[PDB]
Specification:
Chain D: This is Catalase HPII. This is part of a larger assembly, with 4 copies of chain A. By secondary structure, the first copy, chain A, is an alpha/beta fold. The first copy, chain A, contains 20 helices and 21 strands. The complex binds CIS-heme D hydroxychlorin gamma-spirolactone (3 copies).
Chain lengths: 726, 726, 308, 83
């Protein structure tokens, strides 16, 4: 009996904001949040309260503090089967991590379409707006191991397992609309080049090293996804504020047998937002779990991640109407040419109970499709289909991984497959083969049809010789990088320049930097000159003369490729640091906290120590974290209320808090005497855009602050931050 | 629809005699045979009728006959995920077989005590006669692989998993009361010596080779178990007709904490019975699944295997009262010194549904004990406790083998162990450690007590130095072999002689045979001389002069050591071949089958072809098998009825049938003209004991037959069989 | 796709200071540095220069840029055994990391005693000041995964494999002289409490969370090693500038049979030095490979780590 | 992968080629070969692109599939000629 008598050890089973209560298993935090998959996992959930401690064979243990020994200072005995079971289980806890996307954070949710899509696909999950499909979603980075950091610069994975009535459909996508390479045969080359180098196993979670840029410099097809990774796309603020994409062209097949080419999209309903590099890199040190934490806490707070599924649709007759090949996974389909049609909404509303069991063991694979979908000859997609089945045999210990509970279909599954390691299902069928007469041939094949039919591949025509050959149509490398470049705002372009410059500065062999710069000069001369200036490299007259690649079907830009060009900000779920002092003006704080609450923006109250402070009117203020404990990296904005400002005015951490938030372009609001902090960040007496200031936190102060927060960062501050020592 | 019109593809769900119906998974054969364990397996039993064939992901298959190819004579495509899933599962079906006992056959059943044993043990499953404990029992050979033959000469295993309310108790025993070696450290050496030799992996399922006899000749502690193996104990007629023994001294612990030394026994209620060597060996070729088939068929017929659990109990103060050490596992406890107290009955009444899932994956381990039981310092048992846990990590793929359905306890199990490969249980406990406050320390330790208490080891006193040394009290090797030899009947002695003679003749290095014969002279001179004479060895003077070892506590024999000295033959479930002709006298056949039915004896009607024959009165008689297809090896007796005997009189197969049965000492009955077959087996006109003959199959002729069958074999016939060419 | 004309792709095979040259595998950076164990690995070392690219079955590859397909825009074919071998190997690269000490950095070296210790031990590797024993050493943190950061606050592992003439001896110690717990039976309890919490798998590489401190508060036996971990011992400057300890009392047994209790120590010849917490924390973000890198580079420079 | 415990089954002595074998594959359970190549990918410059592809030829050439003509639809169908 060790719990505190007041019951404070146990978080409330109701939505609560980040930091208010200790986090908990989903089924304890939100017992009433249910779906058909979550319900189907009940057969394996194991409780604890009121139960006796036992071995795995069910024998009650009397003393879980000691090994059995001959004398209390004697040798441990081999007959101690309780010790050995317990240590054996511990000794074998780990399984191999994923070869790529080893680092990932997952949650349960549900999907529903806005309307029936039966005109274009017979897929059962898209057939009826009242059909709710449970999902399990895992977001990830790519390069680092399962214990690497979250806010690296990398591609992110966005994988969705749909538990449909006609099979599992896994939509296994990323946060950019293309990939680095064209053919799956090169995937181990690419992945080897980006991963830690083989002699010394350095660097973790970083493409900033020689072998990556060597590969890139020798394989220009990589340049398009490289631009995306060097942009702020590679450093998202949150999984909730990035886009998702299937990458490849797939097919929808309707009941009449018509094929339509499709690329899959996820639109974040919380908007697109990313970090800045210095913030992102420092954050990997101050909280390497920042995205995992933020996802889990958003869900515990009721700020459910929501995404709109969307389809870019292209008629079969239009396969050849673009300047790029639809089956080339290094090419995107500009939305200006082919709009995204809204299809439905996904809401992630419950955390797992056990991370290892549900997240670490989940298996996603893009070959897991359902009738109404089909593949194309995209030569990356084609080789993926082999990999995702094969890899589970070692990762998850054999071919029964679909019996691990998180992976199980919720719809019926029956067939003649038997045995394998870890076999859970006990087949009673007299027959293990078909055709059989001894069980009247059950289970039976099902003809294809409009609904509840068998899978039949679309009868695409194949004509050609058996060749190991890249299609000539794939042989164009620069126009899509350039389209991306020209679509970004001036600040976004600066951050891409700085991404390339920072990464190449870490490349130890200078020739590789030169060769990358030469590739940039085939994309855009401004970009290439700007990077070259940062590397102390001078372009040759020949490089200054390379003609830029063509526009993409007449487009010189497409704003949908930018994170920020078209405002789409949303402050719900965001968080503000409030820097307290030992005698806060309580009226200021009442208005601040209520304004924040009205818009669903969270606050963390910070001070130089833990415990409490007392406001002017005697109100007791609980402290969430110290200035050092919860750095400005972890918040979206900073508010300093009035009171005894002299208490913190000379505190180095308090001052640095504002400097760091200032440098990282975050809104800062200063009330009453908190305005003396202006001196620390060098603000003009008459003030500047991005700094909110007033005699008090009343009237328009909080509105002005929330407006800045809706635009995410104060991009206009960029020229001011170069001089600041932070 | 592929099943026949008349429904004859599907066996009736009611008990039926061997061969009347096709055999079937146990839940389909006996759907209403239930126990708590069988019921708890319902969550993983999977049916088949009326379900669609699917992938493992639940996608319906339209065509399970063809791979996806480019054109109907084209190459197979990598995007065929249906083909690859189906082939991947197939490719990974096999798991490592058991290191030893890989060949085994298992069934479900239940156990119930005769009375409360609370005076001597607190084990909950022995606390009350109305407590029914489900069991799963696997019988096995030891040497051969999972694909080897059943009726080899070998020790047999007899492992019972008890699913009790206080934990799984596994009683992991053999069909002899001792083992070959004293100390677990030598187990790999003994097992390597007996297993196929390492250069060429020969012989399978046989100790008859140089390395086994080399080890035995250099390690006289093995001689006791070697006597058992060389007797007819090594060739049981059925798993139903053999004894079981725990081998080791264990302890019972009562509620007061008093310890009593116990050895465990299983007494077969069908009595003890074995084959003879020629018949066993030939049977490994004619039906290598004979025991597996016989067990499965006995249960389907309602001839449930039944065994009485027996305890030999020795007070703690009596540890040193014998002239052998109680902890020496090469020594037996004569029942004349310590009687077997009969404590309960186990009945095996349902076959598995799927052999691989329930039998091959079952894990039995003698370290799996429950409160009320404890270990002793027996140095063979001590090292076993390490092995049976360790070996499961590769065999069953990791430390969650207890989550494999057949292995799961039926009682509660909760603890802080987490992860490992194929983790099924999803833990909701906020804590994964104790002591913890965050879950109020649950699940919690439980103090030992009279019922539902935690496990505490018996506080045995340990005094000595850390040594690798065999106890001097273990250094006596000959007196138990001799006691066993002297307790056998004369024909049992002659079969032991023949077992050593046959085995040693297959040892290629003659000096090994000589060294073994020397060891036999240390046991009994008559035995040593008889085996020497069959090997062409002459005993030396020194050898004729070896003083016999002493009697065991004044015993010059113990008839409980013989299979046959004390009659306990039971005919229920035995089988008779009836050799048909093309016009059987229907009256003979009516009386025969009626009398067999009355005693629960089964019949197989045999002929020179399949189909049916017609009796004199027009009764249509279906044929179960040919003479060659179901040899006399597979039956307990042979009856030849009257009719058109000329039809079979000149059939080599029917004559040989009789010669084979005669040679193997089986009862033979001949009615009316069937007495003309007396010529083939050289029976005088006046008849012989063990040949039943009469003008017709009257009531008397059947009683005579059935009396002979109760005595199992006609031992008096042995001196007539060596003249017989069969 | 080829080396620069000037040979600048390749590190000089001579000792060079950190940053002067790209780092390289040991056998290429320092081909003349040998010891008996390094030489015995020669049977499995595989070179690359001037050799044809092959399958694992030795079949030369003509085109390692493409899958085999039906037409140059067609489906990939199942008969592409080159693609499938390559992808299969890649799909099966990972093995389970170590339950604890998964993050670690290792090097080869050698050991010799100053004088024969035959009076206290018959161990052959301590019997002769001129008999050298090859070693292989791995340093590590405890809590975080193989891809977690180096400069966390944690106990450090210091494991030495001595390849002696009479057997392998592994001296598997840590950088403090004790451990958190008394009986091995509690190891899973302590390790689970310090590791990322089981619902959400947070935090990596840190004891700064509720479960660890819950366990500590309820198990005062932990307080000694906790004091070490909270001190600057928990954040060393380098593996070269920490102490190592075997932790337990072992025995030495001499030829006469006499047993002496012993506790093992390693003294860093580069001296004791640690970071400060703000520095170590921010360094896990600016260079999560800092101790790994600094060990590799010290050895490439000739600043060989030395321990007594 | 299950029978022989992982993708390095070609390093089990009986399975080993007697002719050279070199490539950029790495790791895997019970890895025996210790690779010294600074590169584990191609194309690479840091090891001058070794080990290198070899064109097909009359002897000692790289493997190239015979350029058979393929023509028909993606079908799961038995050839009638097999019936
Ligand atoms: C032929 C190799 C191959 C190729 C070309 C790709 N992948 Fe992949 N991917 C794998 C081979 C692989 C894998 C080895 O099979 C992984 C790691 C382990 C896992 O189960 O699958 C995986 C994991 C993986 C995951 C993590 C799933 C999870 O959360 O568990 C995501 C999100 C993606 N990939 C996304 C992509 C995208 C969008 C690609 C191209 C547009 C891509 N992959 C190409
Ligand atoms: C230390 C080595 C060792 C020792 C000395 C013994 N065993 Fe054992 N036995 C094993 C190590 C082992 C094992 C390797 O752990 C097995 C094989 C696979 C497994 O699951 O357990 C096994 C299997 C096994 C089985 C088969 C259980 C099943 O059906 O799956 C039986 C019946 C026995 N043993 C019985 C005995 C008896 C009665 C022994 C002495 C009285 C004995 N064993 C000594
Ligand atoms: C009973 C469990 C247990 C206990 C009580 C300890 N260890 Fe341990 N340790 C393991 C169980 C373990 C392990 C689980 O067996 C590891 C991880 C995987 C491995 O190969 O060994 C390991 C790894 C491991 C390593 C890393 C070896 C490497 O680099 O690969 C070191 C340095 C230590 N341990 C040091 C210690 C010290 C100084 C301990 C006490 C003073 C200690 N361990 C107690």
């Amino acid at each position: 009996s060790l719990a505190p008598e007041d019951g404070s050890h146990r978080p409330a089973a109701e939505p609560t904001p980040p930091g208010a209560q200790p986090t908990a298993p989903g089924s304890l935090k939100a017992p009433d949040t249910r779906n058909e998959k979550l319900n189907s996992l009940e057969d394996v959930r194991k409780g604890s309260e009121n139960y006796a401690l036992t071995t795995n064979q069910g024998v009650r243990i009397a003393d879980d503090q000691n090994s059995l020994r001959a004398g209390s200072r004697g040798p441990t005995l081999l007959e101690d089967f309780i010790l050995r079971e317990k240590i054996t289980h511990f000794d074998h806890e780990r399984i191999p991590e994923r070869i790529v996307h080893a680092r990932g954070s997952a949650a349960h949710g549900y999907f529903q379409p806005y309307k029936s899509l039966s005109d274009i696909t017979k897929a059962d999950f898209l057939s009826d707006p009242n059909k709710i499909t449970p999902v399990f979603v895992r977001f990830s980075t790519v390069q680092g191991g399962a214990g690497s950091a979250d806010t690296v610069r990398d591609i992110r994975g966005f994988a969705t397992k749909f538990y449909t009535e006609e099979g599992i459909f896994d939509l296994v996508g990323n946060n950019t609309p293309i990939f680095f390479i064209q053919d799956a045969h090169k995937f181990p080359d690419f992945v080897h080049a980006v991963k830690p180098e083989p002699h010394w196993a350095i660097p973790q979670g970083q493409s900033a090293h020689d072998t990556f840029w060597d590969y890139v410099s020798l394989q220009p097809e990589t340049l398009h996804n490289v631009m995306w990774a060097m942009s702020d796309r590679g450093i998202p603020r949150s999984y909730r504020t990035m886009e998702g994409f299937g990458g490849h062209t797939f097919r929808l097949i309707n009941a009449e047998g018509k094929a339509t080419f499709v690329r899959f999209h996820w639109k974040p309903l919380a908007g697109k937002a990313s970090l800045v590099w210095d913030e992102a890199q420092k954050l990997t040190g101050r909280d390497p779990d920042f995205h995992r934490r933020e996802l889990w806490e958003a869900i515990e707070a009721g700020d459910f991640p929501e995404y709109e599924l969307g389809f870019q649709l292209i008629p079969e007759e239009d396969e050849f109407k673009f300047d790029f090949d639809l089956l080339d996974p290094t090419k995107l389909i500009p939305e200006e040419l082919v709009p995204v049609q809204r299809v439905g909404k996904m809401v992630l509303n419950r955390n797992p109970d056990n991370f290892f069991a549900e997240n670490e063991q989940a298996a996603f694979h893009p070959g897991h499709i359902v009738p109404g979908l089909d593949f194309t000859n995209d030569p990356l997609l084609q080789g993926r289909l082999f990999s995702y089945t094969d890899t589970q045999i070692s990762r998850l210990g054999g071919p029964n991984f679909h019996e691990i509970p998180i992976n199980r279909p919720t719809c019926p599954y029956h067939n003649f497959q038997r045995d394998g390691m870890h076999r859970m299902g006990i087949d009673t069928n007299p027959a293990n083969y078909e055709p059989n007469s001894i069980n009247d041939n059950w289970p039976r094949e099902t003809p294809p049809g409009p609904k509840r039919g068998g899978f039949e591949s679309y009868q695409e025509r194949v004509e050609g010789n058996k060749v190991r050959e890249r299609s000539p149509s794939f042989g164009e490398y620069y126009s899509h990088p350039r389209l991306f470049w020209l679509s970004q705002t001036p600040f976004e372009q600066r951050h891409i320049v700085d991404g390339f410059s920072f990464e190449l500065s870490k490349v130890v062999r200078p020739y590789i930097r030169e060769r990358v710069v030469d590739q940039l000069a085939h994309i855009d001369l401004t970009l290439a000159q700007a990077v070259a200036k940062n590397l102390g490299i001078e372009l040759t007259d020949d490089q200054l003369n390379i003609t830029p690649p063509p526009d993409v079907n007449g487009l010189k830009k497409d704003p949908s490729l930018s994170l920020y060009a078209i405002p789409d900000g949303d402050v719900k779920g965001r968080v503000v640091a409030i820097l307290l002092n030992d005698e806060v003006r309580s009226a200021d704080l009442l208005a601040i906290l209520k304004a924040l609450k009205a818009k669903g923006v969270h606050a963390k109250l910070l001070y130089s120590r833990m415990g409490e402070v007392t406001a002017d009117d005697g109100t007791v203020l609980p402290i969430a974290a110290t200035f050092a404990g919860a750095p400005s990296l972890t918040v979206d904005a900073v508010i300093v209320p009035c009171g005894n400002i002299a208490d913190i005015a000379d505190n180095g951490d308090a001052n640095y808090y504002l400097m760091e938030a200032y440098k990282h372009l975050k809104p800062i609001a200063l009330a009453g005497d908190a305005r003396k902090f202006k001196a620390t960040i060098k603000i003009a007496d008459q003030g500047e855009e991005g700094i909110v200031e007033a005699d008090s936190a009343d009237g328009s102060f909080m509105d002005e602050l929330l407006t800045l927060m809706a635009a995410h960062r104060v991009w206009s501050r960029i020229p001011k931050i170069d001089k600041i020592p932070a």
